A paper describes a structure:
The structures of [name]–miniGs and [name]–miniGi1 provide molecular details of an aGPCR in the recognition of different G protein classes. Similar to what has been observed for the class B1 glucagon receptor GCGR26, Gαs and Gαi share a common binding cavity on the intracellular surface of [name]. In association with a longer αG–α4 loop in Gαs, which causes a steric hindrance, the receptor ICL3 adopts an upward compact structure in the [name]–miniGs complex but exhibits an extended conformation in the miniGi1-bound structure, which results in different patterns of receptor–Gα interaction in this region. To provide further insights into the autoproteolysis in modulating receptor activation, we also determined the miniGi1-bound structure of [name] with the proteolysis-deficient mutations H565A and T567A introduced in the GPS motif. No electron density was observed for the GAIN domain in the cryo-EM maps of all the [name]–G protein structures, suggesting dissociation and/or high dynamics of this region. Alternatively, the cryo-EM maps of all three G protein-bound [name] structures display strong densities for a lipid molecule bound to the intracellular region of the receptor. Using [name] as a control, we discovered that two lysophosphatidylcholine (LPC) molecules—LPC 16:0 and LPC 16:1—bound specifically to [name], and that other classes of phospholipids did not. It stretches from the membrane lipid bilayer to the intracellular tip of helix II, with its fatty acyl chain penetrating into a ‘tunnel’ shaped by ICL2 and helices III and IV, forming extensive hydrophobic contacts with the receptor. The LPC molecule serves as an anchor of the receptor intracellular region, stabilizing the conformations of ICL2 and the intracellular ends of helices II and III, which are functionally important and have extensive interactions with the G protein. Therefore, it is likely that this lipid-binding site is unique to [name] and potentially ADGRF4.
A defining feature of the aGPCR family is that most of the members are autoproteolytically cleaved at a highly conserved [name] proteolysis site (GPS) in the GAIN domain, which has been suggested to be critical for the maturation and function of these receptors. The cleavage results in two noncovalently associated fragments: an N-terminal fragment (NTF), which includes most of the extracellular domain; and a C-terminal fragment (CTF), which contains a small part of the proteolysed GAIN domain and the transmembrane domain (TMD). To uncover molecular details that govern the tethered agonism of the aGPCRs, we determined the structures of [name] and [name] in complex with different heterotrimeric G proteins.
Numbering used by the authors:
A (entry chain C): 7 to 62
B (entry chain R): 567 to 852
C (entry chain A): 10 to 53, 182 to 230, 241 to 354
D (entry chain B): 2 to 340
The structure:
């Protein structure tokens, strides 16, 4: 019964094998760009004044 | 002074100088113990207690502790002042406050005892916490206030609230104001007696079913720990007061009464607070 | 504002539901497959809750064991239980090994460090015939006690009791099958009220 | 014999995958982010304290408008909160007292609940009659319903305790898609912002990225060593943070197929119940079993702040869609709105 499971697992591994991977530096740069793109739109990071803060 | 004048018509003069130092040191140690207990209670406020059981018990203990501290300092103030320096100036208010606070402490011990009895005899019964707090505060402080004001309004016109040197409540063929301290305070202790016995009746119940014996008389330690914890909190040591009623001539009753009740705060701290493992774990590292 | 009135009404309903549920016992049942739990639960998927009222006291009993998944991932939600009902099939020696394993695992969890156990000894009537047919000494390598049925039951109780390492904080109970359903309910109610008394005393600092 | 060849082929495939991963790992994110300035200490105050629950709140979710809130507890009822005014909107008496997951619709119409009953109950908040009613009862799972989320008003994704995820059609009531392959119980999942692919964490220390349209395991990450209880995508949708039972929040990347950093400390020894990201994704949040939360820097692996103030273990925390505030529900039946 486990032979079918093993064949399915190896087929899934082969399917996942031919997947392109970008450099870690490129992903880090993309994350950097996204974080500094919406940095001004992060009320947690930048304390919003109580004038427009609904929870204040 | 002798601390036996609380529930005795008079104290023998042959024993007063010996017991006076013991009373003073016991009350000093009691003041220290109550200070430490209040400090640790403020430090551990609203954190250890989770259920309504612990909340109610802690409220009872903190009320008892505050009443004991205020009553003890008032008694010290009343004793240290002369009876002729201020016949109505400082000792009248002092004795009024001291009697009121002793009786409030007695009724708070009654509150704790009846709470335990109610929570044991009726297992599955839920009552409102806020309503219970209100009832306890109203009857543990309103009744002492009422009895204090009626005592200070009945015996005042006859100038029999205080007799000669003793500006505590008087007796021995005068008025009857001391009955507000001898009758109720003893009776409360009497209740706190039977409740204790009730706890014992529920601490040695037969094993449910035919389960085999678990401990080879190892529950003796638990029973003794429970008894030593609950004895000073319920104020059983005040029972010896009736001994002062019985004879008022022998010094053994007065000596043991003063020794046990002077260190009552020390016993409360050692058993009510120090013996609790939930506080031992948090205090060992702090 | 209508929102304030809606909030007040919802709070009133929640408080009423809490008052209603405060009187509940919320027991918990375990055991093995065909270990006699059916007799203990029918005296009147995942888990099933059976509700029964005795002496004006309501009990919910959850038949844990049908999940067939990781117990450590959803057992933490089974707190606040008055006691743990356990059923053991005395007649079946094979079931005994995994019954003991489950009892040891459950009693040793960090969550069930204070809850008591009301473990039962089911199939006691058929166990007497099993001993006569097959000696107990052959079944178990360890000592089987005296040849009498009562000493065998005592040995079973003894080897069940010492598995609980938290002897001081847990007060377990032992009972056998009763033909009348009233006896089982009476024993369960007595155990529950004793456990509640002990819990109240512990919360009062007397212990 | 025959199975030995399959085992060897799987082993060599795994070796090739890990060799490719090591080759792609030129430099970690921590080294690159040495130039960035630290966020510094952050002040977090509980603006509101939502109270009224009677048992341990175990799951909760935020509304799509960042105003309404939903919470579920083992008491046996579901509560909808108005986070702005602390008011209560609806209180559904769930037929099962054990609820383990809750989900709010992206339109504020349907609310999903699930637990040890192995069924997902979908309730309609807006009804013509007025009284809340069970819109649907999805059944077919043989294990406890650990997590559930709404793709839209008509489609749901659920995670069960039998190592299976299921994409259910609400109108049909049957499993539109079934995702299987986990060797351990799947505990939580999160949805990408585009709702085109979702990653789910299991109890085998493996987070699997599945595609909802295709129904197959697109990717698999194995970086943990214990149970995984928290899943949350990055706001960009390219990364996601996994919380485990070892106080190690690991940030994985979809495109890189790597592990970026493992937020951990020597002081923390407990596990993770839930994680979340800020609106920009720079400020990560996590909930621990040591009675308080922890706010980290998602690019510097530094503990930016502590959210102590809960008397019991924190169960579920979530950030609003607009990132105005973060809600936190713990086991003491308490919801706190930190800002
Ligand atoms: C802090 C604040 C507070 C303090 C402390 C606490 C306590 C108070 C009080 C309690 C409670 C009381 C009330 C009354 C009772 C009832 O309700 O119900 C009746 C039945 O009927 C009962 O009955 P019997 O039989 O009588 O039982 C017994 C009871 N007792 C009370 C008398 C003991
Ligand atoms: C509960 C245990 C540990 C302590 C009990 C202390 C108190 C309540 C006890 C100790 C000694 C007792 C006294 C001993 C002897 C007499 C003489 C007689 O007239 C009966 C009552 C009376 C006056 C007793 C009243 C109660 C008493 C004062």
């Amino acid at each position: 019964a486990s032979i079918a499971q093993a064949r399915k697992l190896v087929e899934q591994l082969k399917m996942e094998a031919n997947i392109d991977r970008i450099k870690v530096s490129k992903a880090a740069a993309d994350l950097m760009a996204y974080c500094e793109a919406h940095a001004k739109e992060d009320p947690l990071l930048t304390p919003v004044p109580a004038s427009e803060n609904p929870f204040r | 002074t002798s601390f036996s004048i609380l529930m005795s018509p008079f104290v023998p003069s042959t024993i007063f100088p010996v017991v006076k130092w013991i009373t003073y040191v016991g009350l000093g140690i009691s003041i220290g113990s109550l200070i430490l207990c209040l400090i640790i209670e403020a430090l551990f406020w609203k954190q250890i207690k989770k259920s309504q059981t612990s909340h109610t018990r802690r409220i009872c203990m903190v009320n008892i502790a505050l009443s004991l501290l205020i009553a003890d300092v008032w008694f010290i103030v009343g004793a240290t002042v002369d009876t002729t320096v201020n016949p109505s100036g400082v000792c009248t208010a002092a004795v009024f406050f001291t009697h009121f606070f002793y009786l409030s402490l007695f009724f708070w011990m009654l509150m704790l005892g009846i709470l335990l009895a109610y929570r044991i005899i009726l297992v599955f019964h839920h009552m409102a916490q806020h309503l219970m707090m209100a009832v306890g505060f109203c009857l543990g402080y309103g009744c002492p206030l009422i009895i204090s004001v009626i005592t200070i309004a009945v015996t005042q016109p006859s100038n029999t609230y205080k007799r000669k040197d003793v500006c505590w409540l008087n007796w021995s063929n005068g008025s009857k104001p001391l009955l507000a301290f001898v009758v109720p305070a003893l009776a409360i202790v009497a209740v706190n007696f039977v409740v204790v016995l009730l706890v014992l009746t529920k601490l040695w119940r037969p094993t449910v079913g035919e389960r085999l014996s678990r401990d080879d008389k190892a529950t003796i330690i638990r029973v003794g720990k429970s008894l030593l914890i609950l004895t000073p909190l319920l104020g059983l040591t005040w029972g010896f007061g009736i001994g002062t009623i019985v004879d008022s001539q022998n010094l053994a009753w007065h000596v043991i009464f003063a020794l046990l009740n002077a260190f009552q705060g020390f016993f409360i701290l050692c058993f009510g607070i120090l013996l609790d493992s939930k506080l031992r774990q948090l205090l060992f590292n702090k | 504002k209508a929102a304030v009135e809606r909030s007040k009404m919802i709070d009133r309903n929640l408080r009423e539901d809490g008052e209603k549920a405060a009187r509940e016992v919320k027991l918990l049942l375990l055991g093995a497959d065909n270990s006699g739990k059916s007799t203990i639960v029918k005296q009147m998927t995942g888990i099933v809750e059976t509700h029964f009222t005795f002496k004006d006291l309501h009990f919910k009993m959850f038949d844990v064991g049908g999940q067939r998944s990781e117990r450590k991932k959803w057992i933490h939600c089974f707190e606040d239980v008055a006691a743990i009902i356990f059923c053991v099939d005395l007649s079946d020696y094979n079931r005994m090994h995994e019954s003991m394993k489950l009892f040891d695992s459950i009693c040793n969890n960090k969550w069930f460090t204070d809850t008591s156990i009301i473990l039962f000894l089911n199939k006691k009537d058929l166990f007497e015939e099993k001993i006569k047919k097959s000696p107990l000494t052959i079944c178990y390598q360890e000592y089987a006690g005296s040849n009498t049925y009562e000493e065998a039951a005592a040995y079973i109780q003894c080897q069940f009791e010492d598995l609980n390492k938290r002897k001081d904080t847990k007060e377990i109970y032992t009972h056998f099958t009763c033909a009348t359903d009233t006896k089982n309910a009476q024993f369960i109610f007595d155990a529950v009220t004793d456990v509640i008394i002990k819990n109240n005393l512990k919360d009062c600092g007397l212990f | 014999s025959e199975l030995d060849q399959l085992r060897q082929e799987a082993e060599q495939l795994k070796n090739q995958i890990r060799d490719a991963r090591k080759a792609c790992a030129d430099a970690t994110l921590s080294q690159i982010t040495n130039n960035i300035d630290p966020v510094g200490r952050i002040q977090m105050r509980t603006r509101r304290t939502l109270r009224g629950h009677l048992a341990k709140i175990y799951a909760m979710h935020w509304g799509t408008d960042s105003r309404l809130l939903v919470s579920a507890s083992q008491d046996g009822k579901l509560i909808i909160w108005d986070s702005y005014t602390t008011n209560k909107v609806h209180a559904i008496p769930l037929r099962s007292s054990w609820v383990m997951t809750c989900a709010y619709a992206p339109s504020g119409n349907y609310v999903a609940c699930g637990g040890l009953d192995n069924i997902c109950s979908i309730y309609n908040l807006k009804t013509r009659e007025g009284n809340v009613r069970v819109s649907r009862e999805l059944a077919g799972h043989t294990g406890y319903l650990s997590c559930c989320r709404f793709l839209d008003d008509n489609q749901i994704v659920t995670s069960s305790g039998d190592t299976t995820c299921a994409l259910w059609d609400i109108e049909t009531g049957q499993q539109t898609t079934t995702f299987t392959g986990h060797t351990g119980d799947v505990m939580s999942l999160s949805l990408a912002p585009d709702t085109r692919l979702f990653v789910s964490g299991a109890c085998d220390a493996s987070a699997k990225l599945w595609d909802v349209r295709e129904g197959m395991c697109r990717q698999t990450f194995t970086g943990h060593e214990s149970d995984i209880n928290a899943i949350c995508f990055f706001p960009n949708g390219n990364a996601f943070a996994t919380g485990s039972d070892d106080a190690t929040c690991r940030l994985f990347d979809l495109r890189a197929d790597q592990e970026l950093m493992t937020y951990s400390h020597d002081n923390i020894i407990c596990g993770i119940t839930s994680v979340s990201f800020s609106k920009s994704g720079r400020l990560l949040l996590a909930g621990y079993d040591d009675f308080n939360c922890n706010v980290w820097d998602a690019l510097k692996a530094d503990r930016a702040g502590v959210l102590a103030g809960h008397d019991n273990r924190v169960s579920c925390l979530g950030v609003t869609d607009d990132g105005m505030a973060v809600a936190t529900g713990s086991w003491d039946s308490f919801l706190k709105i930190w800002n």
